Amino acid sequence: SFLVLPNIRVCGATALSSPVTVGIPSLTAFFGFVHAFERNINRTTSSFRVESFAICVHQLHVEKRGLTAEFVETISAPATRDDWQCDVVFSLILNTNFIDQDTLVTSLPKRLARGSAKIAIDDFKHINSFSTLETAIESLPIEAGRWLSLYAQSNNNLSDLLAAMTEDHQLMASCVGYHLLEEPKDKPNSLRGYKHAIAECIIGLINSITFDPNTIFWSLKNYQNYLVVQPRSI
Amino acid sequence: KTITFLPCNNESLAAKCLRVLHGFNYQYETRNIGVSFPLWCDATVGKKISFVSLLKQHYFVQMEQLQYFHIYVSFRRCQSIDKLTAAGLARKIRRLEKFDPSSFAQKEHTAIAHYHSLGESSKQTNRNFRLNIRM
């Protein structure tokens, strides 16, 4: 069982994946897009439970579009910040636990890191579910792309990062997970009534595969100290 | 009526239908009824034969009992095409003697436009000919 979500054209995303890197959005944001799609189907079919996912990126285009904030209370605008935005077009393949077209469309989450995520109506035909990996990757259109595996080789430093960047220019650092500063406790106000901790961004290098499967499929691992969206092989 | 052939050769089967139309016209001495083929295509005469102005003759009744039968434009015989064969060129010179025969010469280049001969024979003699029929 494999489910195919093709052509998720996102208009205005954050290129700020970290307080450090500007480029493709943090892989935790791609995980939030998948897990909110997992959580919307559980209203109707409550046993769905996505295990992993695979990302096929076309067409980044990172730009310095601005962001006009609204007026705040003595009424003026707040302080201004340079804004980096990007326009990701990608096909998402998810490994389902085990569905109508009307259920798959209305359960799509409508944001991917602050950006309007949409599928065209003429691409609603290509939301079919497949049982093998070969038939799913032959099914999707927009053939040129990358498949986004993690680069696992000894980057303990920015000089270790930039040494990998100058060898292959398209190597695309981003935010991969979160690193806790303190163990989660009970706070008087936390977003939706859970334990709150204070974390920091983890930067990893992101490869690309011509296309074996465990290098591609990303999933969220939970450790006591930190949380990272890893591929299944690593 | 139109007789449509459904079993083959449309050449040597439409020529048999005209021989029955031939022998009918000397029993009764009538020349009114004519013949035409709606499907007169280039490849073949066709599978359709119609008479305008025969089905009570012994040929059409016995052929009806088997599985195969059903029971503006002008179709005329061109006997100038019978003269274009080299046996007919020698028939033409024998009349003109009855005189240098070496003064004659062949055409060496002739073009013929869609002659559609149906093969038949004579019963008065034992002799064969063709039905070179055009539009």
Partner: protein, 91 residues
């Protein structure tokens, strides 16, 4: 409820005429007018932004106390033509 619309326009301009896309907002440390853009096929192309488009659908507010022209819907609904605030909290 979902309700997708796909809108497509067809503008017949004069010969060789101007188009006016949206333009960027950046901090200052020579180019005085920089357009917002995407990549369509293999080329750059002017766009008219997603927040700019949503502000045009939401120009509804003609119920402020001296209403002539409809304003963009928001808190203490501001006018950016004349730098004022209709629906100021003193009202």
């Amino acid at each position: 409820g979902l309700a997708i619309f796909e809108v497509r326009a067809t503008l017949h301009l004069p010969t060789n005429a101007m188009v006016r896309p949206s333009q960027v907002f950046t901090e200052k440390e020579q180019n005085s007018r920089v357009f917002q853009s995407t990549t369509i096929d293999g080329e750059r192309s002017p766009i008219l932004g997603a927040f700019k488009t949503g502000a045009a659908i939401a120009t509804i507010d003609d119920w402020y106390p001296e209403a002539t022209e409809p304003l963009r819907v928001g808190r203490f609904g501001v006018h950016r033509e004349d730098v004022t605030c209709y629906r100021h909290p003193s009202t």
